Design a protein around this ligand. Structure first.
Ligand SMILES: CCCCCCCCO[C@@H]1O[C@H](CO)[C@@H](O)[C@H](O)[C@H]1O
Ligand SMILES: [Cl-]
Ligand SMILES: [Cl-]
Ligand SMILES: [Cl-]
Ligand SMILES: [Co+2]
Length: 297
C-alpha cells in the first residue's frame, strides 16, 4: 500500500486514535501519508516569492527554525523578513500537525531545516549521484544522521494547479537486498579524514556509509531504475504528504513551488524500531552500525 490517503483538511485538525494508529502504522511501514485537501495558503504579500529568481546560489532556500536563520536567498531586509515569516509559519504548522497526528513520538520529534523550492524540477540536470529523477532513499554525504530518521512533510503550493510528479519504489528491505552484493566497507581511516577536514558535519557512522552506498549505487543501477516495482503519482496542488524519506524509495519527475519541512527522530522512539533502515541494515550485516548507540541490558 504505497500511498495511504487521509481526510484531514486543517493543520489544527484533531484526530481519532484510529486515524492516529492508521498513520503511524503506515508511516513506519514505508507508505506515503497523503492529505489531498491539506492546503498551505500564502499571504498576498508572499505571492511574489512564487518566483525562482529568489534562489541566489547553488544551495536551496532554507530556514532553521531552531535558530530563526534564513539562508540561500539575498535581498532587502524587509523581503528576507517576509520570506523568513513564510518558512517559519510552515515550520510551526507542520510541527503542530505532527504532534496532533503522532502522539506516540511525543517530544522525540526534533525539527530540522525548512526549505522552499521554487525551481521547476523538469528543467534540472545534475550528476547521476544528485539526480533525483532516480529512485533513492535520502542520504546526504556532508550530513550524517548517526542512525536518526529523516521525516519530511511536503506541501505543493503551485498557484497554477500543477501537480508534483513522484515515483514511489519498492520496500526498503527489497532495495537493500537488491543492492547488498554491491555494498563494501569504507576504506580504513577515510571517514576520520572526512571529519578532520570538515567535509562531514560530525563523523560519518557505518550506517551513514551504507545508506550513501545504497543511495549512490541504486541510482547507478540502470536496470533497477528501469524495471524495479514503482508507481507514478501526481500530488495535486494544495495537497500535503508525509514520508520517512530515508526508507521510502522515491524520485521526483516534475513540478514547481514546494514547501518542505525536515524532522529527525531517534530510532528508539519508533513504535516498531525493527522496521527502521538502521535495524534492517544492522540485521543484514550482523553488526552495530552506529558507535554511540545506547546499550540495553
Ligand atoms: C493545534 C496546536 C498543536 C497542538 C500540539 C499537539 C498536542 C499534543 O497532544 C498530546 O501529545 C502528547 C505527546 O507529547 C500526548 O502524551 C498527549 O496524550 C496528547 O494529548
Ligand atoms: Cl551533502
Ligand atoms: Cl575512519
Ligand atoms: Cl519533491
Ligand atoms: Co530524496
Amino acid at each position: 500500500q504505497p500511498i495511504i490517503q487521509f481526510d484531514a483538511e486543517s493543520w489544527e485538525a484533531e484526530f481519532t486514535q484510529e486515524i492516529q494508529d492508521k498513520a503511524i502504522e503506515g508511516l513506519e511501514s514505508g507508505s506515503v501519508l497523503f492529505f489531498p485537501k491539506l492546503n498551505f495558503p500564502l499571504l498576498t504579500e508572499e505571492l511574489k516569492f512564487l518566483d525562482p529568481t529568489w534562489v541566489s546560489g547553488a544551495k536551496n532556500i532554507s530556514y532553521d527554525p531552531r535558530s530563526a536563520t534564513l539562508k540561500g536567498v539575498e535581498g532587502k531586509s524587509e523581503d528576507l523578513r517576509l520570506l523568513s515569516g513564510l518558512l517559519k509559519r510552515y515550520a510551526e504548522k507542520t510541527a503542530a500537525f505532527l504532534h496532533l497526528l503522532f502522539p506516540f513520538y511525543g517530544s522525540s520529534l526534533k525539527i530540522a531545516r525548512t526549505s522552499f523550492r521554487p525551481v521547476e524540477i523538469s528543467g534540472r540536470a545534475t550528476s547521476a549521484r544528485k539526480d533525483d529523477t532516480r529512485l533513492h532513499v535520502d542520504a546526504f554525504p556532508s550530513s550524517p544522521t548517526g542512525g536518526e530518521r529523516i521525516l519530511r512533510v511536503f506541501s505543493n503550493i503551485n498557484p497554477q494547479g500543477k501537480p508534483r510528479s513522484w515515483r514511489i519504489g519498492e520496500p526498503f528491505q527489497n532495495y537493500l537486498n537488491h543492492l547488498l552484493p554491491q555494498l563494501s566497507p569504507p576504506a580504513p581511516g577515510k571517514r576520520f579524514l572526512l571529519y578532520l577536514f570538515g567535509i562531514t558535519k560530525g563523523y560519518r557512522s557505518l550506517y551513514d556509509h551504507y545508506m550513501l552506498e545504497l543511495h549512490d549505487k541504486g541510482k547507478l543501477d540502470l536496470e533497477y531504475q528501469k524495471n524495479s516495482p514503482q508507481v507514478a503519482f501526481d500530488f495535486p496542488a494544495g495537497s500535503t504528504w508525509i514520508v520517512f524519506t530515508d526508507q521510502v524509495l522515491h524520485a521526483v519527475d516534475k513540478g514547481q513551488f514546494l514547501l518542505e519541512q525536515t524532522f529527525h527522530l531517534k530510532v528508539n522512539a519508533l513504535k516498531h524500531p525493527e522496521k527502521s533502515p538502521l535495524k534492517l541494515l544492522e540485521t543484514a550485516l550482523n553488526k552495530k552500525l552506529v558507535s554511540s548507540e545506547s546499550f540495553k541490558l
